[PDB]
Amino acid sequence: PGSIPLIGERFPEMEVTTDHGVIKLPDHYVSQGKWFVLFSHPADFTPVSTTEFVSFARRYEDFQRLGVDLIGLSVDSVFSHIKWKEWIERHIGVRIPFPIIADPQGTVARRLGLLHAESATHTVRGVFIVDARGVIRTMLYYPMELGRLVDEILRIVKALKLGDSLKRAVPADWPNNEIIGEGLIVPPPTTEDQARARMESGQYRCLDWWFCWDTPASRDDVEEARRYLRRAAEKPAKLLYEE
Amino acid sequence: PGSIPLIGERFPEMEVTTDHGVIKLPDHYVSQGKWFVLFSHPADFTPVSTTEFVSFARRYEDFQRLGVDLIGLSVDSVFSHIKWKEWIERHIGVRIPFPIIADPQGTVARRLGLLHAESATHTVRGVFIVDARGVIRTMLYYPMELGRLVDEILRIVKALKLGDSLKRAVPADWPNNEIIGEGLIVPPPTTEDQARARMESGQYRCLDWWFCWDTPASRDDVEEARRYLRRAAEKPAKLLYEE
Amino acid sequence: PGSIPLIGERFPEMEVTTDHGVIKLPDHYVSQGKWFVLFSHPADFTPVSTTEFVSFARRYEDFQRLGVDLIGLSVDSVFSHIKWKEWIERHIGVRIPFPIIADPQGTVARRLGLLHAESATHTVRGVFIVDARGVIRTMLYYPMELGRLVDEILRIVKALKLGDSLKRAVPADWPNNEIIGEGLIVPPPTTEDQARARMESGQYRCLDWWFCWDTPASRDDVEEARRYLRRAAEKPAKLLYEEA
Amino acid sequence: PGSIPLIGERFPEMEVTTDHGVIKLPDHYVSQGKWFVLFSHPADFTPVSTTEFVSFARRYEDFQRLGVDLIGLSVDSVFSHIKWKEWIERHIGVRIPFPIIADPQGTVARRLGLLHAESATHTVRGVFIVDARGVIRTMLYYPMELGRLVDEILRIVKALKLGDSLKRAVPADWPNNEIIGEGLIVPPPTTEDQARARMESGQYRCLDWWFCWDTPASRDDVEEARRYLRRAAEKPAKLLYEE
Amino acid sequence: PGSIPLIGERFPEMEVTTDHGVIKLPDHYVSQGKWFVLFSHPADFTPVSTTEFVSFARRYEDFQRLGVDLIGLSVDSVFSHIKWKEWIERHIGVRIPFPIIADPQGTVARRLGLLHAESATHTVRGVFIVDARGVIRTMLYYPMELGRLVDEILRIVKALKLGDSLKRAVPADWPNNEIIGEGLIVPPPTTEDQARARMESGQYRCLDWWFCWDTPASRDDVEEARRYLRRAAEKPAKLLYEE
Amino acid sequence: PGSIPLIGERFPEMEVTTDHGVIKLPDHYVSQGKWFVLFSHPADFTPVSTTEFVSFARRYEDFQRLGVDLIGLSVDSVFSHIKWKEWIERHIGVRIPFPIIADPQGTVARRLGLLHAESATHTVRGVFIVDARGVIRTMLYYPMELGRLVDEILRIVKALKLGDSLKRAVPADWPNNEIIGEGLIVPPPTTEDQARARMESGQYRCLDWWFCWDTPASRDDVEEARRYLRRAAEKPAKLLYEEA
Amino acid sequence: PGSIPLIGERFPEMEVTTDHGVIKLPDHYVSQGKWFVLFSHPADFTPVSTTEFVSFARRYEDFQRLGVDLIGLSVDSVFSHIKWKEWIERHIGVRIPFPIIADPQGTVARRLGLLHAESATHTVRGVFIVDARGVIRTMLYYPMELGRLVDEILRIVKALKLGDSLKRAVPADWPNNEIIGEGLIVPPPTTEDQARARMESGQYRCLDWWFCWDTPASRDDVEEARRYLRRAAEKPAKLLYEE
Amino acid sequence: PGSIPLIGERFPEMEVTTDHGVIKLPDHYVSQGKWFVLFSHPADFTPVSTTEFVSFARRYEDFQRLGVDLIGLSVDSVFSHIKWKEWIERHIGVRIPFPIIADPQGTVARRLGLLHAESATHTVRGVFIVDARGVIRTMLYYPMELGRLVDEILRIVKALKLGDSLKRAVPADWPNNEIIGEGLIVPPPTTEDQARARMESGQYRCLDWWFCWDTPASRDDVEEARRYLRRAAEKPAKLLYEE
């Protein structure tokens, strides 16, 4: 096994070297009022990793409109990062606009728990979603052999943002939950008096005292979330390999 | 930080009490030739957790079709598990067919790293995908306030099983990857001589010696995986709260 | 073996989550001048535990008029406690009026030595009687398979309170002790001079210098204590399962 | 701040000196097929302790009826034990027939967690109920200033032997439980299957699948247990201090 | 294989419970300008111990005249101490006037190194002679089966006080030493120059420069010391068992 | 704050260098069936020590008749032990016939706990009475400024031998005990049944079940023990400095 | 400070991943009867490192005819190694024929002491000359900013091989030593008798008993060694950047 | 293994006895504004060491030209140092002008890691090149059996000083590098924006964005470096042996 940071913890404080310069995490983003998705890949010049940087690049504008920056990470040097981004721009025709951390020696990798038993040398495909207070909110660990679904990451951030602002919890598969649709959940009562009163109030749609919900999310916010999922389910009309 | 099992490690061998009886993990499933998805939730009788059990239960035939079992986990007793299952069946009309581990005390929870900074008492929403050899293949950690997207879990297992049987890596957003669509990736060469013998063969679609790919997946494999995504994107015909 | 707080110690200071809210022990009660009985049960939705919660609820007025609060504890969550209380109220017709601590993880269980060899996972049936100074006065550990006798717990607190107020020790089986009946005992002298003088005082009934007694409890105090035992001994004329 | 042995544990193996001679616990009783109650008291020639020794001796036959031996314990020597026994026989007119462990130095006291904060030198009033397998079944800790109710200890042993022989759990206040009277409880199901099967079977009176009960104990066993409480509640006809 | 305080050390500081009340040693006696003899016995209600308490009690006036208080010790409680004294006064007709420390648990016994290999549970027959500065001057350890000669304890304290007073050392068997009789010894010179000067002084009777003596003790002090030995040697005129 | 062997322990096994040669203790005596008294003194050529050596030598035959050997101990060398013995013989006219252990470095002294607070350099006046089984029976620790009463050491050895042979305990001040005089004590019963049995047996004189005695010591044995005390008490007829 | 393997020690046993496959050191080379020169550089796609690889490549047949192989090392992955070698071959026209170890994580780097204060993340320019017994013979540590003089490495290996074979020590600046030219040194006598005898024999040219020499090297061996130095000193007639 | 100081570390502060007096290192040279080359040899009156002292001595003016001081080191005492120097002057006709450290006991040796497996007793032939700020710039470890190429040491010093003054890295085999000749390398860009700006400037000869170079060294700098290598390659006119 191995040590990882935890949801609810401040993202580990660290200076990192990226192909855009040295930055301090989480401060660099907290200081701008931005969330960030830090993600890792095993090595530059690898095919699934290439597909993922292109997926994130295609979605960059969607992350930007949420107030979310992106930063990659692998054990390769900055020189390989820059060569790789050149290859991608020259061969795929897609410019990767976000920084990638170069972590030779695996110092950052160890701190984030990114070295798993699958490889002694190269990080798996971790994802850390960090809010504007610098706090880790969600963590995913995909393996070498399987690319991520980048639209799920946009759904996570959007849903966290809505839940944060509306003071609501987010049902499974939102905004298409099979029990309540685009509804969102009132955090359950934690006392008997609070539970009884929530019943008496009659304020919310109610399956039980612990299961109340309403529909506070704007149509634009629901439409935006469902858009990420529609895109994920849709096959591209033009594949990039072709040209 | 906290400590977790890791991708590529065998699932930690343990005897656990479930609401279906005591079983040994991963042996119980390994011995049937089955993969399993073990997931956790914080507490029985909480609303996001209930939406997720319903989502999994509804999608249960889809896991069964792939040869994958489901096993849940929380710090509640087997008695509360059974009561909660009774409630969901009576009130939502969905039967939960799969076992839930009862882990009062957090013994399992600690071995699987499920206790994060968000709560000293209740597990976050972890997911461990474990193959028929008992090896952890993917791990996701969602927080208290955000339900999982269950069709992604179905897409992850389907893709890993497909990659294993076809000896292929799976690109980002597969089967809808923006470079190669439903194409699958040949694991890159790791030696000069291997790299040149691959380029000489003319055997694969090739963007460079390290990015070769082909389309070995049956239409049935491709379309089943896309159906999970389509389902995730689609607004429910009728909400279960209604009835 | 395992470790337990001890009679005569201040109850371990701790913030606990209850289905009534977060409270501080023992301060929450000490601050009100109240005793409390904290008791534990293996798990909600278990049958012996349900019978004991009903028994405590039926005696709740007796505990209150003594100035004693009740607080239960199990490793179940607050949500399970509320659901369980709903079940008991709906099916038994008895409302459980006092809080139950939720201790998933066993942090409280461990501190109070409530996890025995009988179960990995669930507390036994421990009882801690804690006075208005925050001090542990008595501890009982019953096992999973055997429910407690709640009327003994009222006798213990009544007798301890009486003993404190009257500066007396309490004989076995009080108020029906076979030697001195409802008599209470003067704590025995601990020096030779004190022994000598107690005998020359002629103040008390006396079997030896170390065994003096008198009867300073009121009829009402004595009768209250006897009532708890008479109830224990009495078969209910109507059983709750009957109209359940 | 103190360690004690635990319910479900075998009684700590020890050789002890009593005023009846040296014996080995728990073996001395296990090899006779006997239960025992080991109880402690602060000091010989103390008044509450004297009342309790007299209550135990009056009930001595009731213990024998149940196949239960009594064994006391304090920090005093065997000489003081014998002298105290002589006093009680001569002044109360009650012969104390069972052994008392002499524990000067507090070696036994320490191993059973009998020294509490209330004194540093004398044990409190502990009670260990120990079955014929040598296993600890119940423990009570009364303080210096309060005598025990010896009838409850009889009811505990009786009820424990009954639950053992009939494979049942015993409700609160049994045989006068306010829900099921002298009914005894079937240990609840711990799987969903087992729960459904018990319900459908019509075998037991049933408040819910986890609360089944019946009346398997004989009138004789029921009336015996109720008699202990009836005695506890009776005002004695004649007080021993009088004669 | 045991630890004891030492001659010339301050008696261990400790608060002790006696049948006269709680006191602090050596302070309680130091603050009165009194020496004390602390002695121990295995258990109340034992026969050799009873004879020694009666001997002490008989010489109480002699000890008192030397400014020496007496204090006993055993592991029995205060309640036994008091019953044992009542017994001795009732059956032997001797009131024991001095305190006995109750040491159940052996805390004092351990500090004073009174638990030897003979027992396990009960102290040997220790004797600590402690001067009015709280300093240990002599220690005797007699075993279970042998009572002390209490007149030698009187001779010890008498001689030490006189030596302290007169600045003299005390020969073997004093006041009946075979070489110098009731003479007392001048502590020997410790330098060559001091040795020659004593030789040149003619001031003392002298066997060598290191063996000088004189007869500085009053006839009264000598006769008091010989009386203790005379009593020791004398056959009692009428035993106390005769009554 | 010092370590000692204990009564009931076998005397610490050791080879020691004496002015009689090297011997192994307690084996050297155990092998002869002899008891021994090991005593210590701070230093050769010191006055109280010299008086004690003369007292032992004068009682040497008393110890010999009891089957008890004597062995001394100080931090001085064998050469010093020999010169000191020459000095006593020459100037007091007493030959010291028993061995003295030479223990420079305090190896033996440390083992026997003879180094106390009174001197960091020299042993106090310890006494160890050791039986024919090598077992420590009594230990006395006298200080530098006070010589021993050698006759009490003879009383100890005699009384212990008699106790051992007669299976009796020995009262205070024996053979002149104020309660039972020259009587010896039966060790008390240690069970209730043994107690009742002994008190119904009319076998012994008896103050209580735990205080039974009889008179099994012979006149000669009692008179021997009395003689040691009588010698202790007697003002000597001729002082040895007078003819020194 | 840091720790390194030492001259005269067996090279650390380790399995390493190269862009030719996984191999064990030193065993892979020892098995083939080869010396090897292991050298490190900071990162692929760096300019000084690229010039050194081209210099070693130019000299590769010179190493081969000495029975010496070459193996490089950096913290980059094998994919970067292969891309960088493709770049060199395409742009500079030189194929790099020998393996490069990929050491992401710095595992080999830290065993060899290759991480110095100049960079926390990239190795310096270390060189380990290892003989056919697996024994380290010479070590050099050049910094980031300065390329090696590769002809000196060839001179070191040649001279060591010749010295081992002729049982001779090698003068400074050999084969052009200012005192003895292409002469080689007899290892000095270590005893007085050996010194006398060496003098007596008249076997060698001699400056002192400790400084004897002769000229056992073949003309070809001396010429080969001088050729390395002549090449070092000669300005190439055509520079590779030109084409 | 062994412990060494590291490139980029300040040379360990130490006081050392040499045959010119006691000095503090690196302070003695730092406070002169001087670089120094500290080198070691096994023992005085050994032949390879003697050749190397002669080689350094003859190149002494060349080190002085660069503002570099030389300092030797062996475990022999200063008396042996002065005697050995006298022997070299009388016999070979060369005055050794620079100090040698006397390190019997190996205090300095251990701190510099000069004691390798080849001998427990005598240093290897270490070389530390230390710049005028006292920083270690390069280290070499030659063995007992192989003399140094002293002209390489001069080339390293010159090239490092040149690099420092021109902000340039120095390619393999400089000034005769087969790709770029006497050109010097611009340290590669470490961010994407810098790499792009460099390409946009057209300021340098450019093989790629990470491989730019120019020719900023003076002819004097080039020809002096090349001279060291020419000298190394040149057969001496007259051997010093001939006399």
Curated annotation (Swiss-Prot), chains A, B, D, E, G, H:
The active site is at S49. Keywords: Antioxidant, Cytoplasm, Disulfide bond, Oxidoreductase, Peroxidase, Redox-active center. Induction: Up-regulated by hydrogen peroxide (at protein level). InterPro entries: AhpC/TSA (IPR000866), Peroxiredoxin (IPR050217), Peroxiredoxin_AhpC-typ (IPR024706), Peroxiredoxin_C (IPR019479), Peroxiredoxin_TDXH (IPR022915), PRX_1cys (IPR045020), Thioredoxin-like_sf (IPR036249), Thioredoxin_domain (IPR013766). It is found in: Cytoplasm. Disulfide bonds join C206-C212. Pfam families: 1-cysPrx_C, AhpC-TSA. Its EC number is 1.11.1.24. Its main location: cytoplasm. Substrate binds at R125. It comes from the Archaea. The keyword rRNA-binding does not apply. It catalyses: a hydroperoxide + [thioredoxin]-dithiol = an alcohol + [thioredoxin]-disulfide + H2O. GO terms for molecular function: antioxidant activity; identical protein binding; peroxiredoxin activity; thioredoxin peroxidase activity. GO terms for cellular component: cytosol. Residues 5-162 form the Thioredoxin domain. Changing C212S: Abolishes enzyme activity. One of its GO terms (biological process) is hydrogen peroxide catabolic process. Homodecamer. Pentamer of dimers that assemble into a ring structure. Thiol-specific peroxidase that catalyzes the reduction of hydrogen peroxide and organic hydroperoxides to water and alcohols, respectively. Plays a role in cell protection against oxidative stress by detoxifying peroxides. Belongs to the peroxiredoxin family. Prx6 subfamily. HAMAP family: Peroxiredoxin (MF_00401). PANTHER family: ALKYL HYDROPEROXIDE REDUCTASE C, THIOREDOXIN PEROXIDASE. The active site is a conserved redox-active cysteine residue, the peroxidatic cysteine (C(P)), which makes the nucleophilic attack on the peroxide substrate. The peroxide oxidizes the C(P)-SH to cysteine sulfenic acid (C(P)-SOH), which then reacts with another cysteine residue, the resolving cysteine (C(R)), to form a disulfide bridge. The disulfide is subsequently reduced by an appropriate electron donor to complete the catalytic cycle. This is Peroxiredoxin. It comes from Aeropyrum pernix (strain ATCC 700893 / DSM 11879 / JCM 9820 / NBRC 100138 / K1).
